[PDB]
Design a protein around this ligand. Structure first.
Ligand SMILES: Nc1ccn([C@H]2C[C@H](O)[C@@H](COP(=O)(O)O)O2)c(=O)n1
Length: 223
């Protein structure tokens, strides 16, 4: 309950993950990739044949979901039912399925405790959509990392090409656009910056610049 927390909310592909890892390292604080949980759940639904369009069927899945995260030894390691799925949850599908699953209010609430349990001394950087607005309301440090949707798409495309996957800009743009709209239009706990959240727009800023500003702001408020 009583422990500092830095929330980093923002749309898809805004670089929250990186920014979260970089700050966790610079502060030797714990990390929480909330998206990973939603993605893990969606992967459980697929394996256990649970209808992703059914709130009733997802709830029992959510409350009894056996997940597990291991310390970022250079990377994150997601474990479902004792099986490293770290790569499988990083596909487009799952990502689409996590959005879908994420829309049901009853589901989110059934996951509330698991996320809040990451709040431990000395600190916790929390990456998600509603960390600063629902999950940890009283966070002393709230950042809303964002960009234009065109930029985030270009970055995503360039990242895919690095790994050698075919790409299309138009398509990718429509992929995230849909994703955000869903997470933004959602009647319960939608994407939206907390009033006291610092809006970080990284459109023209390099990666180091983002970290630089994020850390400057954090250290200031946390003394
Ligand atoms: N705190 C969060 C994190 C994620 N999501 C949902 C909407 C995102 O589309 C999806 C995957 O998020 P991420 O790409 O950050 O893994 O899960 C959410 O509703 N709340």
């Amino acid at each position: 309950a009583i422990a500092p927390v830095i929330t980093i909310d923002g749309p898809s592909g805004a670089g929250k993950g990186t920014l979260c890892k970089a700050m966790a390292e610079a502060l030797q604080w714990h990390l929480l990739d909330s998206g990973a949980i939603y993605r893990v759940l969606a992967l459980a639904a697929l394996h256990h044949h649970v209808d992703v369009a059914s709130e009733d069927a997802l709830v029992p899945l959510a409350s009894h979901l056996d997940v597990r995260f291991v310390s970022t030894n250079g990377n994150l390691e997601v474990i479902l039912e004792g099986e490293d799925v770290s790569g499988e949850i990083r596909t487009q599908e799952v990502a689409n399925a996590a959005s879908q699953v994420a829309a049901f209010p009853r589901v989110r609430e059934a996951l509330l405790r698991r996320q809040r349990a990451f709040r431990e001394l000395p600190g916790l950087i929390a990456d998600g959509r509603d960390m600063g607005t629902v999950v940890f309301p009283d966070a002393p440090v709230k950042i809303f990392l964002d960009a234009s949707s065109e930029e985030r798409a270009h970055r995503r495309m360039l990242q895919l090409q690095e790994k050698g996957f075919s790409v299309n800009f138009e398509r990718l743009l429509a992929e995230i656009k849909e994703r955000d709209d869903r997470d933004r239009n959602r009647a319960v706990a939608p994407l939206v910056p907390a009033a006291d959240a610092l809006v970080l727009d990284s459109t023209t800023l390099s990666i180091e610049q983002v970290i630089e500003k994020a850390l400057q702001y954090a250290r200031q408020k946390l003394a």
